[PDB]
């Protein structure tokens, strides 16, 4: 018997409807940036 509503289909539908990218770039991008500044400070002190 066919599975009428697969998991990935429902997940993609919900994701697309909620979307209708920038947030992920901002959050992940800021984390990557704060981390670079932090790794670099751990370098100046050692210098």
């Amino acid at each position: 018997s066919k599975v009428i509503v697969p998991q990935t289909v429902r997940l993609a539908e919900e994701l697309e409807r909620q979307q209708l990218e920038k947030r992920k770039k901002e959050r992940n991008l800021h984390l990557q940036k704060i981390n670079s500044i932090i790794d670099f400070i751990k370098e100046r002190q050692s210098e």
């Binding site: 066919k2 599975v3 697969p6 998991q7 990935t8 289909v9 993609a12 539908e13 697309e16």
Partner: protein
């Protein structure tokens, strides 16, 4: 997934089915070995569909060019039957076989329809499915085709050229 190298055996049983189906427009099942190969192909195809009803199995199936090419071949044969082309005309003595074949294929398509979500302009799956939708009188088939079409339009832009431009006013009116 838990049993790798299981799909290769089924493919070995399934590709000669492609050759047979191409040779299915005339009386060509005269021998018993031909019938046995055809039945083995049908059984392997049903097994593949039943497994594709699961997430891991369909994820493994999508990453396979052979299965997708076979599904496309069967869909193009169905489109040739539907539009009434003079190239390949099904011999009614074999119709039974073809019938079962088509059904299984569509089910498979339905599943993998979730993993080819953004369909481009000149997509053969979309054209085959809209032809079959305009032709068929089955109900299971109509509902499956509608689900498959609605899943091939998940992440598509309106301004960007997409598959939604292959939906003439006839299909929307239908």
């Amino acid at each position: 997934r838990t049993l790798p190298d299981l799909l290769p055996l089924f493919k070995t049983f399934i590709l000669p089915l492609e050759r047979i189906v191409e040779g299915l427009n005339k009386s060509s099942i005269c021998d018993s070995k031909a019938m046995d190969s055809l039945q083995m192909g049908l059984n392997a195809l049903l097994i593949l569909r039943n497994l594709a009803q699961d997430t891991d199995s369909v994820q493994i199936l999508v990453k396979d060019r052979e299965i997708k090419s076979f599904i496309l071949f069967i869909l193009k044969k169905f489109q040739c039957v539907a539009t009434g082309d003079n190239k390949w005309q099904l011999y009614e003595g074999n119709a039974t076989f073809f019938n079962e074949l088509t059904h299984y294929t569509l089910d498979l398509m339905e599943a993998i329809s979730s993993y080819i979500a953004p369909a481009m302009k000149d997509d053969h799956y979309f054209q085959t499915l809209v032809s079959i939708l305009n032709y068929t009188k089955d109900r299971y088939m109509v509902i499956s085709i509608l689900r498959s079409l609605s899943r091939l339009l998940v992440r598509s832009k309106a301004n960007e050229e997409s598959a939604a431009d292959n939906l003439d006013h006839k299909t929307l009116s239908l």
